Amino acid sequence: LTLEIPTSPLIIKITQQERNILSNVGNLLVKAFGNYENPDYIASLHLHAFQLLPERITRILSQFGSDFSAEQYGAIVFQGLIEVDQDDLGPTPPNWQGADYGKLNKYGFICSLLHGAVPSKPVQYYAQRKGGGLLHAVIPDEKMAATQTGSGSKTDLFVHTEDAFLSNQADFLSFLYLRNEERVPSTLYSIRSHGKMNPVMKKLFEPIYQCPKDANSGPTASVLYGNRELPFIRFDAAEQIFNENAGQTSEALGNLMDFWDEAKTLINSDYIPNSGDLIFVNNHLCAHGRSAFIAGQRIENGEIIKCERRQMLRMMSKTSLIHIRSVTRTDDPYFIMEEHLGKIFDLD
Ligand SMILES: NCC[C@H](O)C[C@H](N)C(=O)O
Ligand SMILES: [Fe+3]
């Protein structure tokens, strides 16, 4: 019978036994490898992922990695993946630069294991903080309050797939919420929520769209690619549509406007992540964002509740080092040097 169109992500309630295993597995890996960027750990990542993760998590992620069917949302919420000791974590640093990665080391092991079970290899992009490592602290900055970045707060972060301007954008993403006391909803948008291929969607297969770099003669790409009936997406609502300098053709902007009108009714803002929740996303199916918020506060019965500022950890991964090899550093096949749709950063 009828197709069952996904409108929300799969919600997995992590158990106390699973939390405890992940903690003690994380603690063992820190003692064994020191840090999650250790080359000996990375080379044997999939082995540790499949051997050390709780069975149910491994099944969920293994199934998800190869699932591009009509019923797949392209996002999983792992509720209560970790217990965050808020007093040990201490105050949120002023910016991402202030993050203590010694503190976050266990979290980066746990996150890399989740990517390893897909299977997928964690990667870093020069397009993102000159690399910034395999794990990124996403903290609101007062200086970059009304910006279209993770460092943003005061404004809503319109739905986007990560790095729509790169031909070698992340395959999978994980967002580990350490703190979300402001109670900011995590917005998600799946191309699968559209259902069957329609004429509005078909126009997005044309490589007539500008994909500008993060907040004239640039190269163009297709918004939809992959299988013609069940496609993959590269989309940035703020950079491709709502940016004056997008440099779109009238035909291209119209097709993007027509698409946006359909897509915006499908955005899911129902999920407000709690501390210790992780959102695992297939970056080719599901776009992400987050609503506008005043960092360090929430409002209850018309009263301002001051709180600790939002703190989230982002990890990105690629399922094949082979494909991206032309754009990665010679001395590091996990470091992507791509700047814009095939073009590589010219440093000297
Ligand atoms: N559109 C991606 C932007 C990143 O989330 C944030 C950026 N690296 C920053 O934290 O300054
Ligand atoms: Fe993003």
From Swiss-Prot:
InterPro entries: TauD-like_sf. Its cofactor is Fe(2+). It is an enzyme of class 1 (oxidoreductase). Signal peptide: none annotated. It comes from the Bacteria. The keyword Oxidoreductase applies. One of its GO terms (molecular function) is metal ion binding. Belongs to the clavaminate synthase family. This is L-lysine 4-hydroxylase. It comes from Flavobacterium sp. (strain CF136). The lineage of its organism: Bacteria, Pseudomonadati, Bacteroidota, Flavobacteriia, Flavobacteriales.
